[model samples]
Target chain A: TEFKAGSAKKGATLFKTRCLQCHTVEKGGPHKVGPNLHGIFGRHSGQAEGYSYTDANIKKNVLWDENNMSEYLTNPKKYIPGTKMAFGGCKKEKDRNDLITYLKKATE
Target chain B: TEFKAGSAKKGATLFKTRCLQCHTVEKGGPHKVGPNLHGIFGRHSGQAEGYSYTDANIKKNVLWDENNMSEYLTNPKKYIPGTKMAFGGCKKEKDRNDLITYLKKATE
Candidate 1:
């Protein structure tokens, strides 16, 4: 099926419920379990403000893309050792795609 | 002015910030600072599961409409001397309208 803006709106809700408690995509947003996710895609894997990334993340040496984000959201620890995005990543492909779409739209 | 859905969505955010601390509209949600608001308006003023309304709230014979909700939100203690909504009411009409819109839409 083709993507739609309406789905991304729904996906924003999903992000709030499941993800915003930890990661934030905007600067100065409340930080809980994870760091702000602004500029996550295409940024170096372990570079968010004030977060003490694990040694494993520093060594992983990878750029974030749609594919890597999907895999990471499916299982955080599996993607980067010692990284601390603790909440289990999105298991549903639709939710992940929508959230990625929302992030992309908001960020870029 | 007629209300817009976009403002209501923004109001939903305001409600999340100021109100979701306790009240909920969905059943079986995590009970927080207030009761689940499944059908708040037109329902009894102080009626929800497991919440013991204060004597003042019980004595006050009122229905929650936009007008009363506005006053109540501005000053819960003033509106119902013995009610238990700890957070103060919204001073802005726009916020109140948006929150009321969100509440109405979700409830109905």
Candidate 2:
């Protein structure tokens, strides 16, 4: 696939620093402040098993395709108003790119 | 106040390190993953204004007085099952005691 620059390895580090507190990518990973994100790609928003999605997310119909997720990862509240994800979005373009790459690889 | 050993100053440091990721203790503080905890002592559970509380917390009847808070701070899930505060609890008794002391002092 033609791609913007990113490394799954670097993204793993970033995920640890930024997202590990709230999310898990491994199957059967423990849900934290947010839902476990294992198999997040192509999954419907707010449908992670055992997670208590906010009303907005439960009703949201969006799927987690790469394009959609990349945009959402840049700015969560801006992309989906009233999301319970409470995080300040990834500010750097490279960081967002790397994180997305890592999410795709790790969640698989 | 005659008290069991706990230093508010030390608690402040501990709060910054461990709790700042999810909580704000100022009266007008920004809420994070959890509610702002200003004036938390003696307050009803999950009643912080401007923050969305979990259903369990909203319906919880417990007050956050020193004794109760001390126990809750030891193990959030143990004290209130289904709480959204994802912390694993302060394992050390002194840490919990000191944190409660700092919360009392700083929020007043």
Candidate 3:
């Protein structure tokens, strides 16, 4: 795995701009349209506390790792068909990298 | 003031049919298009944990009593002017009263 260290600071900024509308990374956070992302890394999909996820997400049975998260963030609908997440991907590789980096640090 | 007691059971059915798409009344439930309805009665509006409320909602400065909830539910846009609740009100007064009754019981 050719994983490069990304800047968590930059990732935080990107997350606030792009992902904050529908998701939250805070512990014990309330879910929005999407589930809370606190400690999302290494967690299974559709398991956030109090969130009512779609059948697509619940049955996806995927784990949240850097590589998987990157794939999902790159193209949500394409990566997981029938997902309720309507937001398009980050598009930029740097943005995805930064977001995953931020999630890695912030979620820990 | 002639307050008629409503049927919580009927309200639950109505809520599941209409309100379940956007809101949840269970404690620590996920927020969909709107915030969770747990303990909403007697609480300050827009104060749900980790929910990202609109500026208009945050500044409404209203309490969530039966009277206020009824008025807001009657006409969200008209009552708040800039509220983000897009769902139209229950036209039938009985429906509104029933929904409120269900909320009161379920949230408690």
Candidate 4:
């Protein structure tokens, strides 16, 4: 296992600063700079319904999973060159683990 | 600058083993698993006229430059999810510099 189960408490704090402006976890939340991130775990990269995606993401089209998400969260722009997302990514592995853990619960 | 002009000699030697099987650098070389990389600088990704690219590349649609190439060369599959290229990518900065330097000369 390459990951450690992280603190959702810390993740919630991290999210307020990093992802809150652009995303939402509620199933029917409104879209902003990015899509509402509900049900993101099993969905494909660009399949957040009602949100438009860049070709870089649609063409990538990989099923979202923890492993892929971990790689992607390291550097969003670097991973998907034409992605419209503007946030810098989480560089620390521990922080990523926490973020993913929180997203899993909050979006569920 | 973030790079060093590397040894073409070392790069050429590295090329024979790492990239020669899948790619070519000559002006009109045959396409193997990957395309001929002639004139790769100053071009867009997936624009090698005769080659067919997966949408992950065609959709990236950005101008190629040294910085972009450096990012891509670090990990091919991670950079472009649906990419057909199968290489794991050059890891060390020095090795990448050498490889890129060699590609520039060979493709020139």
Candidate 5:
């Protein structure tokens, strides 16, 4: 696993600093500028109910998983061109791994 | 206009009575069980920003206007089969006309 070495605890702090404002990991959380990311591991790109998506996001139509999510965390606009997410891409591979690990558990 | 005789004032009352539970006509209003209905005029099915839509609605792909909006108001699921909207049919053509009149202005 690319994320085999990732730490979910450290990832939690990273999420607070970076992803918390626009995302919520809890089930049934509210959508912000971005959709609530609860249960994202197995969902499709635009399947988050009640959240409006750019045609780019919906048409891209890939089932999310560890590999693509890691790539997306590295760069959102690049992975899905024209996505409305406004985050700067994460540079550190370990941090990306950690965040993915955290999301895997936290989003449940 | 099928709504030529419709009254926005009366529609406002009808909207409050019948449609307010799941929809909001105010722009930027929070999405309830349904999407915020601001600017529904001239919009296509499933195109409401930040709103999730059933595949059925998106595939229907008709821009909203007086005639179809009236039909949808009369019977939502029947107009667009498999829609999640839970409203019972509004049997009165006058009432539906009035609601359309209110929505045209209120959604702006």
Candidate 6:
């Protein structure tokens, strides 16, 4: 799917207020519930710096493309076991889509 | 005191998985467990938009300054009696300060 600026913007707001507490969009940020989201889109999994990742996450080789992001946002545990993204997942398709768009822009 | 860039990044992770279930940072957003925090610092207590202020909060026009946030995070109920901000306030002074600095940087 093509990128939508508005979706990203909306997702950015969602992330900042809600998700920022755990996910970092900047480089060299710590890994909280999840890894830093900086340049997550199209980046390889098990690749964040400065924090220990889950064994499940380390074993998996994943790329954070838009589709993958959407799926992961929809259900983080299903994507990787023992993962710490503990707020469950974005239950809304629109929210997931928008967050993926936001990730694309943030990483760009 | 040197604002630990590392600390805010650390706090961000704690806030997301733990805090984002309730709070918001952007404007024109919904109020969940607490109010939307967009530009919350230096803003009045009952000042967030699109939110129905608590009867107790409406009585006082308080701004979220460094001291106030520090104190509030230390004890939300003590800060504003009958306030709905759940999740007990931060106990560490360093964590509180770093979070405030992060808040300032975020609004800026």
Model 4 docking grade? incorrect
Question: Which digits, one per residue and each the tens of the lDDT, describe model 6 over residues B33-104?
Answer: 677677775445787667777787866555455555667788888878988666777787777766665665
Q: Give per-residue CA lDDT, model 2, range B33-106, as digits (tens).
A: 88877777545676777888888776765655565677777888898888888889887888887887798788
Binned by DockQ into CAPRI classes (incorrect, acceptable, medium, high), candidate 3 is: incorrect
Model 3, stretches more than 4 Å misplaced? Answer: B1-108
lDDT assessment of candidate 2: 0.77
How well does candidate 1 score on lDDT at residue A81?
A: 60
- Give the TM-scores of the predictions, in the order they appear: 0.45, 0.48, 0.49, 0.49, 0.49, 0.45
lDDT tens digits, residue span B1-108, model 4: 244569999999899989899888898798888888887764567788878899898876644544457778899878878888888888999998898778868886
Instruction: Provide chain B TM-scores across all predictions.
Output: 0.83, 0.90, 0.92, 0.92, 0.93, 0.80
Q: Rank the candidates by lDDT, best first.
A: 5, 4, 3, 2, 1, 6
DockQ of each: 0.01, 0.01, 0.01, 0.02, 0.01, 0.01
**Each candidate: what lDDT?**
0.68, 0.77, 0.78, 0.79, 0.82, 0.67
Specify the CAPRI tier of model 2: incorrect
Per-residue lDDT tens digits for candidate 5, residues A1-108, read 234548999999999999988989898799998999998864568989999999999888755666658888898999889999999889899899898889878886
Off by over 4 Å in 2: A1-5, B1-108
What does candidate 1's lDDT look like per residue over B1-108, in tens digits?
Answer: 122233668778987898877877775664566777776654446667687777777668565544456678777888788677787667876777788777767765
Q: Model 5 chain B — which ten-residue stretch has the worst lDDT?
A: B1-10
List model 5 lDDT by residue over B45-69, tens digit each. 7888788989988888755766668
lDDT of 3 by residue, B1-106 (tens): 1123489999999999988989988877888898988888645677888888888887775656565677788888877778888887777778888988888789
Q: Candidate 5, which CAPRI tier?
A: incorrect
> Per-residue CA lDDT of candidate 1, range A1-106, in tens?
1222236797788888988777777745655577677766545566776787777876785555555567778888877767766766778788888887788666
